Amino acid sequence: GEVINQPMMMAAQQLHREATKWSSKGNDIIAAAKRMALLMAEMSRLVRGGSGTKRALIQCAKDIAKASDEVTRLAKEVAKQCTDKRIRTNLLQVCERIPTISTQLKILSTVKATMLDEESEQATEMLVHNAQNLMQSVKETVREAEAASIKTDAGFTLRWVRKTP
């Protein structure tokens, strides 16, 4: 039913809330962020699964990583054309952090995967810690990239259409 990993969920959701403020039309980062939010949530379900979700647990962390690569990719392109020195620095900071995290998530998920023994319990904690860092970094990426779309001869554009009530 709903025996999901709640700390992966509050973390997945805390991301979702940020991305859901927008439209995905003309914004692949926003779309990849929502996808990441749904995958992390999906991982949240299977993560505690006994057997047969092993393949699933890695498809999940594989797709997440793939989406992270795209978020990183797009954020680099956003930063390249940013005129602002500070914004660009911050943006570049996460396009360094995101790859590290995503790669580690893949490693850690595969672990908790083959484990389906206190060691198993720690494998969970390490995965949760990492997952949380990923969701945070992506949230931070979304905000820096939105601020970078405010501030000449560029042809790249992320559409930031919000639903501010």
Stretch that binds a second copy, among 3-11, 84-92, 103-111, 117-125 (CB under 8 A): 3-11
Identity of the amino acid at 103: T
CB-based contacts of 142, cutoff 8 Å, min separation 6: 18, 19, 29, 30, 33
* Closest distance to a second copy from the beta carbon of 153 (Å): 27
Cβ nearer to a second copy, comparing 48 with 151: 48
* Closest distance to a second copy from the beta carbon of 32 (Å): 5
* Closest distance to a second copy from the beta carbon of 151 (Å): 26
Reported as type and span, the H/E element at residue 45 is helix 28-46
Computed from CA positions of residues 128, 11, 97, 35, in that sequence, does the dihedral angle turn out positive or negative?
positive
> In this structure, what token pair is assigned to residue 22?
């927008």
Q: Show contacts with a second copy in window 37-66 (CB under 8 A).
A: 38-39, 41-42, 45-46, 48-49, 53, 56, 60, 63, 66
Stretch that binds a second copy, among 69-77, 100-108, 117-125, 144-152 (CB under 8 A): 69-77
Please tell me the distance from the alpha carbon of residue 126 to that of residue 112, in angstroms, as a whole number: 9
Please check whether residue 23 is in contact with residue 159, taking contact to mean a CB–CB distance below 8 angstroms. Answer: yes
> In this structure, what token pair is assigned to residue 2?
């709903």
Q: Please report whether residue 14 would count as binding a second copy according to CB under 8 A.
A: yes
3 state SS of 162: strand
Residues that bind a second copy (CB under 8 A): 3-4, 6-7, 9-10, 13-14, 16-17, 20, 28, 31-32, 35, 38-39, 41-42, 45-46, 48-49, 53, 56, 60, 63, 66-67, 69-71, 163, 165
